[PDB]
Write an enzyme that holds these catalytic residues in place. Structure first.
Site, PDB file in Angstrom:
ATOM      1  N   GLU A 284      10.301  -1.662  -7.464  1.00 20.52           N
ATOM      2  CA  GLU A 284       9.344  -1.153  -6.573  1.00 20.52           C
ATOM      3  C   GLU A 284       8.045  -1.177  -7.250  1.00 20.52           C
ATOM      4  OE1 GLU A 284       9.950   2.663  -4.714  1.00 20.52           O
ATOM      5  OE2 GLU A 284       8.243   2.348  -3.496  1.00 20.52           O
TER       6      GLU A 284
ATOM      7  N   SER B 167       3.355   1.648   2.986  1.00 19.08           N
ATOM      8  CA  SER B 167       3.766   0.521   3.498  1.00 19.08           C
ATOM      9  C   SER B 167       5.418   0.405   3.844  1.00 19.08           C
ATOM     10  CB  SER B 167       3.389  -0.702   2.845  1.00 19.08           C
ATOM     11  OG  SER B 167       3.795  -0.573   1.362  1.00 19.08           O
ATOM     12  N   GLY B 168       6.233   1.533   3.390  1.00 25.30           N
ATOM     13  CA  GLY B 168       7.567   1.391   3.840  1.00 25.30           C
ATOM     14  C   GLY B 168       8.381   1.048   3.079  1.00 25.30           C
TER      15      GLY B 168
ATOM     16  N   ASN C  27       0.799  -1.098   0.119  1.00 28.36           N
ATOM     17  CA  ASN C  27      -0.081   0.164  -0.083  1.00 28.36           C
ATOM     18  C   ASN C  27       0.842   1.239   0.072  1.00 28.36           C
ATOM     19  OD1 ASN C  27      -2.340   1.401   0.100  1.00 28.36           O
ATOM     20  ND2 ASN C  27      -3.318   0.449   1.803  1.00 28.36           N
ATOM     21  N   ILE C  28       0.154   2.476  -0.308  1.00 26.63           N
ATOM     22  CA  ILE C  28       0.943   3.673  -0.207  1.00 26.63           C
ATOM     23  C   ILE C  28       1.193   3.707   1.390  1.00 26.63           C
ATOM     24  CG2 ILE C  28       0.812   6.152  -0.372  1.00 26.63           C
ATOM     25  CD1 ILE C  28      -1.512   5.799  -2.274  1.00 26.63           C
TER      26      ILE C  28
ATOM     27  N   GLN D 111      -2.594   6.883 -15.646  1.00 27.77           N
ATOM     28  CA  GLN D 111      -2.414   5.406 -15.666  1.00 27.77           C
ATOM     29  C   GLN D 111      -1.900   4.814 -16.831  1.00 27.77           C
ATOM     30  OE1 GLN D 111      -3.063   5.080 -11.729  1.00 27.77           O
ATOM     31  NE2 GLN D 111      -2.405   3.133 -13.132  1.00 27.77           N
TER      32      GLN D 111
HETATM   33  C1  LIG Z   1       1.712   2.293  -9.489  1.00 26.73           C
HETATM   34  C2  LIG Z   1       0.793   3.419  -9.346  1.00 26.73           C
HETATM   35  C3  LIG Z   1       1.162   4.231  -8.349  1.00 26.73           C
HETATM   36  N1  LIG Z   1       0.120   5.132  -8.166  1.00 26.73           N
HETATM   37  C4  LIG Z   1       0.372   6.228  -7.397  1.00 26.73           C
HETATM   38  C5  LIG Z   1      -0.200   5.936  -5.595  1.00 26.73           C
HETATM   39  C6  LIG Z   1       0.829   6.904  -5.155  1.00 26.73           C
HETATM   40  O1  LIG Z   1       0.167   8.314  -4.661  1.00 26.73           O
HETATM   41  C7  LIG Z   1       1.897   7.276  -5.942  1.00 26.73           C
HETATM   42  C8  LIG Z   1       3.258   7.047  -5.455  1.00 26.73           C
HETATM   43  O2  LIG Z   1       3.222   5.763  -5.256  1.00 26.73           O
HETATM   44  O3  LIG Z   1       1.431   6.908  -7.335  1.00 26.73           O
HETATM   45  C9  LIG Z   1      -0.997   5.230  -9.073  1.00 26.73           C
HETATM   46  O4  LIG Z   1      -1.954   5.973  -8.770  1.00 26.73           O
HETATM   47  N2  LIG Z   1      -1.284   4.231  -9.962  1.00 26.73           N
HETATM   48  C10 LIG Z   1      -0.644   3.184 -10.023  1.00 26.73           C
HETATM   49  O5  LIG Z   1      -0.787   2.464 -10.945  1.00 26.73           O
END
Ligand SMILES: Cc1cn([C@H]2C[C@H](O)[C@@H](CO)O2)c(=O)[nH]c1=O
Ligand SMILES: Cc1cn([C@H]2C[C@H](O)[C@@H](CO)O2)c(=O)[nH]c1=O
Lengths: 185, 190
Positions: free
Chosen positions: B93, B20-21, B17-18, B70
């Protein structure tokens, strides 16, 4: 080494403005289906993407739908460009190139595609040429004056649009694989 | 036969998750750069696409910019997934998979991506797996509770969003709802 390298026969691309008589021209090749892989512009796909009509949504509201629509066009083009075949000749109506150099470009110019949207499409095109093989040995350019094109459409889009498209086709195919120009007025 | 087939070493994907470290976790691998191809999430690319900040435009106005953003994410992922390397191990990552199965999916669910937009993205994903080779041998899932994640972000996005993302990560990596590509290995970020 790219996807679909050396899997494709001699390929001819039919290029031209809307209403340059491409569909009519390609019908003449119908009787050689057994010998020629003959792929018409995939409009049917664009008009029915799991029920959604992207083409319609694009003409209805370009600022919103041009980006996904053109993105989808690019995909269907690649689908045709790489589709496997046993035939010794392949003829495609339009191409990833007309999509990029004429349609996408024009959509940027008249502000249907905003900068970020255009930039995304372009980044893809650049990645696409490094990774997917687009066989193209000859372009047949159905060259016409925008007015004659406009006329043909009426018997079956603004003239200004057709003018813009025409100029872009001319930049690409005339003013600069081998291009072969036919007069279709 | 796909693009970049047999050009890639053992590949590990860091998922979570956002907050999650992940960025912290990956910094521990920094000192092995000579031995490990180590690709962080390409946020820098998303924030500067010939000057345009797609990530920002997306959070500012999702109904309009989610689709190109996206789409661009997908591209940068493929760029990482296929980038050539001499090293014997590659660590990424996030991935094309998290983008598709979590982010795109969630954006559809909350109506940021309209049907036609979602459908276009999906048609691409389907074409992408027939044509481009995505090497993935092991996923490390930095599993956390949404609340702990939320907390971590504050020290440096709504909790509801983080909850949704968490559930989707769980569907994919634990409950195995989506197509699996390889072994998942779960870590507790606590
Ligand atoms: C891989 C990916 C990250 N992100 C976003 C969520 C986080 O706020 C930001 C950095 O990870 O980018 C997306 O919105 N869509 C995606 O497909
Ligand atoms: C190839 C291509 C066709 N078209 C359109 C114009 C015509 O309205 C319709 C039939 O070709 O599709 C685009 O809008 N963009 C494109 O990139």
């Amino acid at each position: 080494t790219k996807y679909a390298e050396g899997t494709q026969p001699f390929t001819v691309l039919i290029e031209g403005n809307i209403g340059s008589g491409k569909t009519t021209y390609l019908n003449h090749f119908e009787k050689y289906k057994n010998d020629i892989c003959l792929l018409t512009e995939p409009v049917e796909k664009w008009r029915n993407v799991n029920g959604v009509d992207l083409l319609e949504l694009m003409y209805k509201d370009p600022k919103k739908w041009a980006m996904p629509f053109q993105s989808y066009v690019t995909l269907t083009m690649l689908q045709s460009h790489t589709a496997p075949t046993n035939k010794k000749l392949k003829i495609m109506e339009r191409s990833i190139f007309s999509a990029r150099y004429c349609f996408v470009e024009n959509m940027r110019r008249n502000g249907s595609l905003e900068q970020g949207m255009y930039n995304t499409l372009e980044e893809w095109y650049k990645f696409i040429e490094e990774s997917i093989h687009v066989q193209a040995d000859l372009i047949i350019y159905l060259r016409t004056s925008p007015e004659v094109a406009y006329e043909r459409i009426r018997q079956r889009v603004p003239l200004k649009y057709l003018q813009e498209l025409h100029e872009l086709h001319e930049d690409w195919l005339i003013h600069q694989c081998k291009v072969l120009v036919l007069d279709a007025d």
